[PDB]
Design a protein around this ligand. Structure first.
Ligand SMILES: [Mg+2]
Ligand SMILES: [Mg+2]
Ligand SMILES: [Mg+2]
Ligand SMILES: [Mg+2]
Ligand SMILES: [Mg+2]
Ligand SMILES: [Mg+2]
Ligand SMILES: [Mg+2]
Ligand SMILES: [Mg+2]
Ligand SMILES: [Mg+2]
Ligand SMILES: [Mg+2]
Ligand SMILES: [Mg+2]
Lengths: 177, 116, 79, 50, 136
RNA sequence: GCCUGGCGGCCGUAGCGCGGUGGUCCCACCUGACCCCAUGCCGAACUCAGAAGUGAAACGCCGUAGCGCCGAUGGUAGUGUGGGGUCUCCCCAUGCGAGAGUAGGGAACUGCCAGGCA
RNA sequence: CCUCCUAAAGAGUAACGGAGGAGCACGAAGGUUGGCUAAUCCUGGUCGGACAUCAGGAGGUUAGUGCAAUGGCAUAAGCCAGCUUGACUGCGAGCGUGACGGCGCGAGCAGGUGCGAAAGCAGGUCAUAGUGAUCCGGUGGUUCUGAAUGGAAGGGCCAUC
RNA sequence: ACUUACCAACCCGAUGCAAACUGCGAAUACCGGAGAAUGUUAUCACGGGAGACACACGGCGGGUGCUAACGUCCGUC
């Protein structure tokens, strides 16, 4: 909870007045957070995948679902139906908890850090950023690591426009430029 | 779509029940309400019905549309149908899984005297 | 580059038709490769493993056309 | 075509058996599974399959 | 010169060339050179004509070729026999029926246009005739 | 009578799009989730227990011809029979007669049961 | 042997006509119950690019179907999971298609079985290729026969090689 | 990163082509039902006896060939 709460008391408040929506329902809301690994190299390190996966597991509440290769193509050396990545969809409590440990204590550990980008918007109020080396997540035991890996989270919201989407995360501390 | 989904879920059975020509007991559910209809095989005329949306079946239920409520409607259409001598029918979940409040109402139907 | 060769016969196509004293259970229409060209309808169906439409009970052959956008359908009315 | 003719045999007395085939390689384990035995008019475990 | 860059099949049947033409009136340029006969212009023909046409107006004008081959036409070699497999695509033809508008031309005085068309005509195997734009 | 929901008929003159509009009730989103039951991860979906909020979304209704769709008349194409030619193609007599396009139609019609307000 | 055209809108239709496939696969790639729904393009996103996985939006079956072609498939016939062995034995009104040998489709009845709350579905696989008559001989079962009699050998019958 | 009298798919509008294209679609042919006239039953079955399985030209629709052949292969008269 917590951040969820912060959303209703303050935030919807914020966004209603920013855009004076008729209905509260009309106010953007973070729908889900879907963080994915994408091993690419399990095609040789079948074991690398399991690592990554257990990584996403650590970082995120629970069990990573591993994704096969939607279709085989020769470019990258991949047969169709080949375990070549793992992902995790976040909702309710676990989505918020991670939305927080994300901006609260992990986005900070990023390199030098100088802010996330606010142009990383798909055109319909949905985020997407990379992390290039997890570790920034305490849940990972540095002394037990095996590679830098890095994952990529993207935030899907009910916003209709980047204009709005931005404003939304804008209203959680959420870094940015 | 959700309601879209339910229908194609619902479509095969329906059709096989029409193929077989059989007065069917048709259930339909909603967050707040549960309805039941016994519908002649021509597909276009209902013989019997009952649902939590009727003053009576309701004027004595904690909440409409919940396991308990369902039950009432089951035993309802059950008797009502038995009233008109409509015995023997085929249950039609209409996309909803056979399990929920749907199973009651269904079960209640039997325990009332309905054949299926 | 070495052309030639061909399957053979197969017959196939409608065999009963229109009103017609389709007997107890005749193979009326045998355009297999279909279960589609024509669709199992009224008191005739089965539609056998090779999509063959046959009389499920004797009567007159029908042929109609329903509402999943056209869609053929052959059936058997009582005579 | 490489794939062999197996022979499933009635667990009951009966000299009865069904007749099929398995890919002996990919499926080395003697194939078991129930089928109808007409001399005993019952469903009995049939075994035997390479 | 001119022909399908690719073809679902290598060889066509032969069929027949009945009926009136379908692309029938000037709809790109201000003037046309219409068929008026039945038969088949071949590639080297549509070209020979095109050329003549062009070198004539010189620089100016625009040109449109409405017909285009796409028909295989084979030929059993010489002292080979009858039958043993169908022959080899040797050249391409476009079937053309009376009414077919063959060329259109654009940025040029009526006169010259006709002149040019008269010259391209003399390279064609079918009788032809000069058409103007028409309002409807 | 207006409104809504459910089960069908007909299966685009029934759709899509734009605009507008409705929430007492029905619908919907919605709230909660140990649990029934569920997530090849996720209460998204399935589901249970509810009802603080909203009709934003979706849904229904009203408008609207941008598109879709329907669509004459007249002519053209082809074609059975019988004749004929300048027989790779064509014409005449007679019967059948498209496709495309044109004018124009069109913002469905309809039955059973229930529920709400008049 | 199979699919398409040639084939003249029922079937059939030739050529040393035009084009391609088969001589297998699968105990799940069969059954059923429950569930789900591609391709392609635009946009955003660590390593990751034109193209591997994540998000959204258009799209709406151009995807998919073990395999050629065609015809089908959203109620899916495509995709997944649980439980399974109906890839059952005996039969079969009544059709197709063959000169014939034969091949093919089939509801329904009997016994017995799986899935499903039930209605119900299942006698393999979206369908149509994936094959070899007769003889002779082998293997199992079966007193049907068995050259004076009882047996046996051999013969028959059912399965199968 | 810009650019270039380079080529440029897709998309949009305009114009054609198809045996193995089809969101259309005939004429005829073929199947079924009734009916009347008319036909030395022309129909079907069973049985006795055959011959025949080298065809040709012509019309129409086609394949092959050169819309060559008193060519060649099918359909139909
Ligand atoms: Mg609207
Ligand atoms: Mg609204
Ligand atoms: Mg018309
Ligand atoms: Mg035919
Ligand atoms: Mg014909
Ligand atoms: Mg991209
Ligand atoms: Mg006689
Ligand atoms: Mg001979
Ligand atoms: Mg001969
Ligand atoms: Mg002959
Ligand atoms: Mg001759």
């Amino acid at each position: 909870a917590k951040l969820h709460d912060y959303y209703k008391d303050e935030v919807v408040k914020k966004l209603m007045t920013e855009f004076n929506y008729n209905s509260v329902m009309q106010v953007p809301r973070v729908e889900k957070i879907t963080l994915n690994m994408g091993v690419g190299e399990a095609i040789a390190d079948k074991k690398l995948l399991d690592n990554a996966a257990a990584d996403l597991a650590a970082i995120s509440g629970q069990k990573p679902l591993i994704t096969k290769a939607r279709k085989s193509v020769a470019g990258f050396k991949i047969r169709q139906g080949y375990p070549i990545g793992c992902k995790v969809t976040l909702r309710g409590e676990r989505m918020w908890e991670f939305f927080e440990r994300l901006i609260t204590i992990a986005v900070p550990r990023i390199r030098d850090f100088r802010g996330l980008s606010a142009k990383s918007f798909d055109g319909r109020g949905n985020y997407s950023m990379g992390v290039r080396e997890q570790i920034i997540f305490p849940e990972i035991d540095y002394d037990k690591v095996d590679r830098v890996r890095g994952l990529d989270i993207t935030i899907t919201t009910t916003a209709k426009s980047d204009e709005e989407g931005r404003a939304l995360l804008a209203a959680f501390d959420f870094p940015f430029r | 779509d959700k309601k879209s989904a339910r229908i194609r879920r619902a479509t095969r059975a329906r059709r096989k029940l029409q193929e077989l020509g059989a007065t069917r007991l048709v259930v339909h559910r909603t967050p707040r309400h549960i309805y039941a209809q016994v519908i002649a095989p021509n597909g276009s005329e209902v013989l019997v019905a009952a649902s939590t949306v009727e003053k009576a079946i309701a004027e004595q239920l904690k909440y409409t549309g919940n396991k308990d409520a369902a039950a009432a409607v089951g035993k309802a259409v059950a008797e009502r149908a038995l009233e008109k001598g409509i015995k023997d029918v085929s249950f039609d979940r209409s996309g909803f899984q056979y399990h929920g409040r749907v199973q009651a109402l269904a079960d209640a139907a039997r325990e009332a005297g309905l054949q299926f | 580059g070495g052309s030639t060769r061909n399957g053979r016969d197969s017959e196939a196509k409608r065999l009963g038709v229109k009103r017609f004293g389709g007997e107890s259970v005749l193979a009326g229409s045998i355009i297999v490769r279909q279960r589609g060209t024509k669709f199992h309808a009224g008191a005739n169906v089965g539609c056998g493993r090779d999509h063959t439409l046959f009389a499920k009970a004797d009567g007159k052959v029908k042929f109609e056309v329903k509402g999943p956008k056209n869609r053929k359908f052959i059936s058997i009315e009582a005579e | 075509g490489i794939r062999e003719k197996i022979k499933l045999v009635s667990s009951a007395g009966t000299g009865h058996f069904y007749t099929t085939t398995k890919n002996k390689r990919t499926k080395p384990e003697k194939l078991e599974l129930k089928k109808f035995d007409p001399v005993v008019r019952q469903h009995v475990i049939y075994k035997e399959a390479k | 010169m001119l022909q399908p860059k690719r073809t679902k099949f290598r060889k066509m049947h032969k069929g027949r060339n009945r009926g009136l033409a379908q692309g029938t009136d000037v709809s790109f340029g201000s003037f046309g050179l219409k068929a008026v006969g039945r038969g088949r212009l071949t590639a080297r023909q549509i070209e020979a004509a095109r050329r003549a046409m062009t070198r004539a107006v010189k620089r100016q004008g625009k040109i449109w070729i409405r017909v285009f081959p796409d028909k295989p036409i084979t030929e059993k070699p010489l002292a080979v026999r009858m039958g043993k497999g169908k022959g080899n695509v040797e050249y391409w033809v476009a079937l053309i029926q009376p009414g077919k508008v063959l060329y259109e031309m654009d940025g040029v005085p009526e006169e010259l246009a006709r002149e040019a068309f008269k010259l391209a005509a003399a390279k064609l195997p079918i009788k032809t005739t000069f058409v103007t734009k028409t309002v409807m």
